[PDB]
Amino acid sequence: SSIVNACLRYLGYSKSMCHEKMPIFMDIAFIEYCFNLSLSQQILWEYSLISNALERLENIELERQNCMRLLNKETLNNEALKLYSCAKAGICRWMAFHFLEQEPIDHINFTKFLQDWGSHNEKEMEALQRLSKHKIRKRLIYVSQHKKKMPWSKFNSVLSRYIQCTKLQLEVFCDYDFKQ
Amino acid sequence: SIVNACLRYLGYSKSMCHEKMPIFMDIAFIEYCFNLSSQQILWEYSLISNALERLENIELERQNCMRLLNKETLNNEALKLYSCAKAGICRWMAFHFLEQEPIDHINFTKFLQDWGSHNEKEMEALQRLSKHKIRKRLIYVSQHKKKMPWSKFNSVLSRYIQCTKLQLEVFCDYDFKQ
């Protein structure tokens, strides 16, 4: 469909849209696509990719925050806070897992990733220090009992409910609509 | 796909309403509209006038951008092709106008608003014939739509495009390949 290849060619490659604001629904749709939000892990874990995704997630959180300025969607607000913090913490957790599984461990990117996205959390991450550098064999199943501790299914749920909650609040309070 | 979100931007966002529309979009629109790859063309005066406006936009952009080597040739070739293609499109659209009964004749007469270039025999011949009764135009067109079947204008348009994106690809900073 050259008449759509034209549109993508504009967005990815045109002067007027390089330096232009990117609206929230693009980042929403990006999250939905990236994490396959639907009613199970074809997620691509790369620190470039995941950091980008977390950046758009954060972007959504900020727009949601600022835009929130009888109903009491305070409840929706605090709900969205719970969901966001647990979702982001989860994504960073699983990304850390994916970093760990590889041998040798690229640990400067690892630590960096945990200094950009692991500060909304606590200090159990020092635990990660000492498991940053014990040897792989004890660790991979020190790590892999955790997906029946915290299977991805539940973070898929948390993310999906963060999104639907978010675009609910936005659709109701603010002048937003999402259906074609 | 979820590509529609991107489409949702273009069709529906404040920042993209009042914004420049590039030439390759009008190119792709022409190629698509006339199925450049035998009349699955949709002749409705809004559509055809818009399409002709994009065609005109391409001609102007090509013209202005065209401001050892002789692209005198590419230029005048593109001129012939543009004028004959547009004249053809306006002709066929006038035909589709005539075939309908009754005739929305004021949109017809003025149809040649920018499209009805001022060579006045094409059209005064075209319209004296505005209101004899219907068979005359239906077999006047069906006399004329095996005069110059659409295939030939498909060819003319396709080489107008191919010529155009050639000249633009070479001299100026253009690319059309993903």
């Binding site: 008449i3 002048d175 | 489409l7 273009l10 069709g11 529906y12 404040k14 993209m16 309403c17 009042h18 914004e19 529309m21 979009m25 009008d26 629109f29 698509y32 509209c33 699955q40 949709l42 409705e44 809004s46 559509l47 818009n50 399409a51 994009r54």
Partner: peptide
Amino acid sequence: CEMCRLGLPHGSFFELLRDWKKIEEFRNK
């Protein structure tokens, strides 16, 4: 433009895409 005020679709892109779907759903049936 008084159509941005009114939250209305008014763009060369919009005219394009809409023309696109008139042609394409002319095709479909």
